[PDB]
Design an enzyme around this catalytic site. Structure first.
Site, short mmCIF file in Angstrom:
data_model
loop_
_atom_site.label_atom_id
_atom_site.label_comp_id
_atom_site.label_asym_id
_atom_site.label_seq_id
_atom_site.Cartn_x
_atom_site.Cartn_y
_atom_site.Cartn_z
N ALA A 240 -36.31 51.63 84.49
CA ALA A 240 -37.14 52.47 83.63
C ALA A 240 -36.38 52.82 82.35
O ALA A 240 -36.99 53.13 81.33
CB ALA A 240 -37.57 53.72 84.36
N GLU A 243 -36.97 49.00 80.02
CA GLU A 243 -38.28 48.36 79.86
C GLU A 243 -39.27 49.02 78.92
O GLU A 243 -39.84 48.37 78.04
CB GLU A 243 -38.95 48.09 81.22
CG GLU A 243 -38.38 46.92 81.99
CD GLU A 243 -38.51 45.57 81.26
OE1 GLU A 243 -39.08 45.49 80.14
OE2 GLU A 243 -38.04 44.57 81.83
N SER A 245 -38.64 51.15 76.62
CA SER A 245 -38.07 51.21 75.28
C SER A 245 -38.25 49.87 74.56
O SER A 245 -38.45 49.82 73.35
CB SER A 245 -36.60 51.60 75.35
OG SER A 245 -36.44 52.90 75.91
N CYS A 350 -41.61 62.77 81.60
CA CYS A 350 -40.46 61.91 81.31
C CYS A 350 -39.13 62.60 81.08
O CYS A 350 -38.98 63.38 80.16
CB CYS A 350 -40.77 61.01 80.11
SG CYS A 350 -39.56 59.64 79.95
N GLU A 359 -33.67 55.95 70.52
CA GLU A 359 -33.71 54.50 70.41
C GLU A 359 -34.80 54.01 69.47
O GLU A 359 -34.55 53.15 68.63
CB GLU A 359 -33.88 53.86 71.79
CG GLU A 359 -32.69 54.06 72.73
CD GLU A 359 -32.87 53.38 74.08
OE1 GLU A 359 -33.98 53.43 74.65
OE2 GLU A 359 -31.90 52.80 74.58
C1 HEM Z 1 -40.65 54.69 75.54
C2 HEM Z 1 -40.07 55.30 76.61
C3 HEM Z 1 -40.64 55.79 77.79
C4 HEM Z 1 -41.94 56.01 78.17
C5 HEM Z 1 -43.22 55.66 77.43
C6 HEM Z 1 -41.85 56.66 79.48
C7 HEM Z 1 -42.92 57.08 80.24
C8 HEM Z 1 -42.81 57.83 81.39
C9 HEM Z 1 -43.93 58.33 82.13
C10 HEM Z 1 -45.38 58.02 81.84
C11 HEM Z 1 -43.48 59.03 83.17
C12 HEM Z 1 -44.31 59.83 84.16
C13 HEM Z 1 -44.59 58.99 85.41
C14 HEM Z 1 -45.57 59.63 86.39
O1 HEM Z 1 -46.28 60.60 86.03
O2 HEM Z 1 -45.66 59.13 87.52
C15 HEM Z 1 -42.03 58.89 83.11
C16 HEM Z 1 -41.15 59.36 84.08
C17 HEM Z 1 -39.79 59.15 84.04
N1 HEM Z 1 -39.08 58.51 83.02
FE1 HEM Z 1 -39.78 57.93 81.27
N2 HEM Z 1 -40.52 56.88 79.84
C18 HEM Z 1 -39.78 56.29 78.84
C19 HEM Z 1 -38.39 56.14 78.84
C20 HEM Z 1 -37.52 56.57 79.80
C21 HEM Z 1 -36.06 56.39 79.75
C22 HEM Z 1 -35.30 55.90 78.49
C23 HEM Z 1 -35.59 56.89 80.94
C24 HEM Z 1 -34.33 56.87 81.52
C25 HEM Z 1 -33.13 56.78 80.91
C26 HEM Z 1 -36.76 57.42 81.63
C27 HEM Z 1 -36.72 57.94 82.88
C28 HEM Z 1 -37.79 58.45 83.51
C29 HEM Z 1 -37.70 59.06 84.83
C30 HEM Z 1 -36.52 59.10 85.77
C31 HEM Z 1 -38.93 59.52 85.13
C32 HEM Z 1 -39.35 60.24 86.38
C33 HEM Z 1 -39.36 61.76 86.27
C34 HEM Z 1 -40.00 62.45 87.47
O3 HEM Z 1 -40.55 61.76 88.35
O4 HEM Z 1 -39.95 63.68 87.55
N3 HEM Z 1 -37.92 57.26 80.91
N4 HEM Z 1 -41.63 58.20 81.98
C1 LIG Z 2 -42.26 48.64 90.30
C2 LIG Z 2 -42.89 50.01 90.14
C3 LIG Z 2 -42.06 50.98 89.30
O1 LIG Z 2 -42.05 50.51 88.00
C4 LIG Z 2 -40.95 50.48 87.08
O2 LIG Z 2 -39.83 50.86 87.44
C5 LIG Z 2 -41.18 49.91 85.69
C6 LIG Z 2 -40.23 48.76 85.41
C7 LIG Z 2 -41.00 51.03 84.65
O3 LIG Z 2 -41.12 50.49 83.33
C8 LIG Z 2 -42.02 52.17 84.81
C9 LIG Z 2 -43.44 51.70 84.50
C10 LIG Z 2 -41.59 53.35 83.90
O4 LIG Z 2 -41.60 52.93 82.53
C11 LIG Z 2 -42.17 54.79 83.99
C12 LIG Z 2 -43.56 54.85 83.39
C13 LIG Z 2 -42.19 55.27 85.45
C14 LIG Z 2 -40.90 55.26 86.29
C15 LIG Z 2 -39.82 56.11 85.67
C16 LIG Z 2 -41.19 55.70 87.73
O5 LIG Z 2 -40.64 56.71 88.18
C17 LIG Z 2 -42.16 54.89 88.59
C18 LIG Z 2 -42.28 55.48 89.99
C19 LIG Z 2 -41.72 53.39 88.63
O6 LIG Z 2 -40.40 53.29 89.19
C20 LIG Z 2 -42.66 52.41 89.35
C21 LIG Z 2 -44.05 52.43 88.72
#
Ligand code: HEM
Ligand SMILES: CC[C@H]1OC(=O)[C@H](C)[C@@H](O)[C@H](C)[C@@H](O)[C@@H](C)C[C@@H](C)C(=O)[C@H](C)[C@@H](O)[C@H]1C
EC number: 1.14.15.35
Length: 403
Positions: A240, A243, A245, A350, A359
């Site tokens: 995550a 991808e 990014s 997020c 980034e």
């Molecule tokens: C363009 C960048 C990104 C987008 C559009 C994005 C989008 C999201 C979204 C939609 C969720 C909520 C998922 C849900 O409701 O089930 C999420 C969760 C998360 N993202 Fe991002 N993300 C981005 C980049 C990143 C990066 C750079 C990291 C890590 C270094 C990251 C780590 C996480 C983590 C660990 C969660 C889970 C938080 C939780 O479950 O409480 N994300 N992200």
């Molecule tokens: C194979 C299924 C998983 O997908 C992935 O790891 C994808 C490669 C990521 O790009 C996903 C889509 C993220 O960008 C965030 C939106 C959500 C992420 C942080 C989660 O916590 C989520 C549970 C995720 O692990 C699963 C959907």
């Protein structure tokens, strides 16, 4: 009646038009996807409501009476690897989610991300140094892709002889094609193996990286991460971490290139860049769809979603809801983007938002400031979009550097 199948081309060819049509008919509509019956939420208020409703679980590991929980994103994953992909904050519900997120937040901080800025800027420069200054190049392969990967590898302690490999695995995991279900499950096991090694070598040779820190992190009241949790969190942080990014940078490049007026605006006013990044995410959200499981019956937007249903919150359709974003189909770097759902909403918001914005800003600024004559090398209508509702993106984008 007639139920939509998310596998049809209507959800991959001018799909925001299809989401529009569905939304006005019914903001919460039943659909078919990967052979199962699900509920697609296209309305803004409905989507926001669903993400805030904890009766809609995020945990695929929970067992219910006579129910076989199946999240479409784990298409082809054996149970053992599925569990490795699903024992982190994004696949947990409170109170498990609470401690997991608490423990990780202790180390994955804004200070640590800010301390990466000069490195991110340095890596950006280097990649741009290598593409040259004339002709056509694949900006995805040469820039949008390597950048996020190098950044996350440094953050996580992933060394040279390891990177790249996972690049090919992750590609397979991004698409959910039943035909390639076993190959998908295969790639998944590869990443799981890679992570197990990473974690082990990290326990033996500790460093300053985030992974090392998460290994010794502990809280008086919450204890520490178990081996499984540590392994699963590491896996998701890696995947995550780059991808989405890649999608932001690549989609962002395609949008500015195709919207001269907007690009000029950014060039003239660099302070208009942070909001351009937010508008890029709102316009074409990478996580187009997020999955939830109805542990209980839940009524969303007047519709009663049966207990044990799979709900697909269409974050991307929501960002295009007229009632929330006027003239939603207009890419405007100056518009108010507050409230878009690209970074989530609620307890799972997020965690990497700070790093993602850093980034996107550093990358786009550098790209466009370095090539004032940059243009698309293909007709806008010829751009091939990744056929995935999990993580939308562009895998090949030829640009001309000199003009
Ligand atoms: C363009 C960048 C990104 C987008 C559009 C994005 C989008 C999201 C979204 C939609 C969720 C909520 C998922 C849900 O409701 O089930 C999420 C969760 C998360 N993202 Fe991002 N993300 C981005 C980049 C990143 C990066 C750079 C990291 C890590 C270094 C990251 C780590 C996480 C983590 C660990 C969660 C889970 C938080 C939780 O479950 O409480 N994300 N992200
Ligand atoms: C194979 C299924 C998983 O997908 C992935 O790891 C994808 C490669 C990521 O790009 C996903 C889509 C993220 O960008 C965030 C939106 C959500 C992420 C942080 C989660 O916590 C989520 C549970 C995720 O692990 C699963 C959907």
């Amino acid at each position: 009646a007639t139920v939509p199948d998310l596998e049809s081309d209507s959800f991959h060819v001018d799909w925001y038009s299809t989401y529009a049509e569905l939304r006005e008919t019914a903001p919460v509509t039943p659909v078919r996807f990967l052979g199962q019956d699900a509920w697609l939420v296209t309305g803004y208020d409905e989507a926001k409501a669903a993400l805030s409703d904890l009766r809609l679980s995020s945990d695929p590991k929970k067992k219910y009476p006579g129910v076989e929980v199946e999240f479409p994103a784990y298409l082809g994953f054996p149970e053992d690897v599925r569990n490795y992909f699903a024992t982190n904050m994004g696949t947990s519900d409170p109170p498990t989610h609470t401690r997991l997120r608490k423990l990780v937040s202790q180390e994955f901080t804004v200070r640590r991300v800010e301390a990466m800025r000069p490195r991110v800027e340095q890596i950006t420069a280097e990649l741009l140094d290598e593409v040259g200054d004339s002709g056509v190049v694949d900006i995805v392969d040469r820039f949008a892709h390597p950048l996020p990967i190098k950044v996350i590898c440094e953050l996580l302690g992933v060394d040279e002889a390891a990177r790249g490999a996972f690049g090919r695995w992750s590609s397979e995991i991004l698409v959910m094609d039943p035909e390639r279900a076993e190959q998908r499950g295969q790639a998944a096991r590869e990443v799981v193996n890679f992570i197990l090694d990473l974690v082990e070598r990290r326990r033996t040779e500790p460093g300053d990286d985030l992974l090392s820190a998460l290994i010794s992190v502990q809280d008086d009241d919450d204890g520490r991460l178990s081996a499984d949790e540590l392994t699963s969190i590491a896996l998701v942080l890696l995947l995550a971490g780059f991808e989405a990014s890649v999608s932001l940078i690549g989609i962002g490049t395609y949008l500015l290139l195709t919207h001269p007026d907007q690009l000029a605006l950014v060039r003239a006013d660099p302070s208009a860049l942070p909001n351009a990044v937010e508008e890029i995410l709102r316009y074409i959200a990478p996580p187009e769809t997020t999955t939830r499981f109805a542990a209980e019956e839940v009524e969303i937007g007047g519709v009663a979603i049966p207990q044990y249903s799979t709900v697909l919150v269409a974050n991307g359709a929501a960002n295009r809801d007229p009632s929330q974003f006027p003239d939603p189909h207009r890419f405007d770097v100056t518009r108010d983007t507050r409230g878009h759902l690209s970074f989530g909403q609620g307890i799972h918001f997020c965690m990497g938002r700070p790093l993602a914005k850093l980034e996107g800003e550093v990358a786009l600024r550098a790209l466009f400031g370095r090539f004032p004559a940059l243009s698309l090398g293909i007709d806008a209508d010829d751009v091939v979009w990744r056929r995935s509702l999990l993580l939308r993106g562009i895998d090949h984008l030829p640009v001309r550097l000199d003009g």
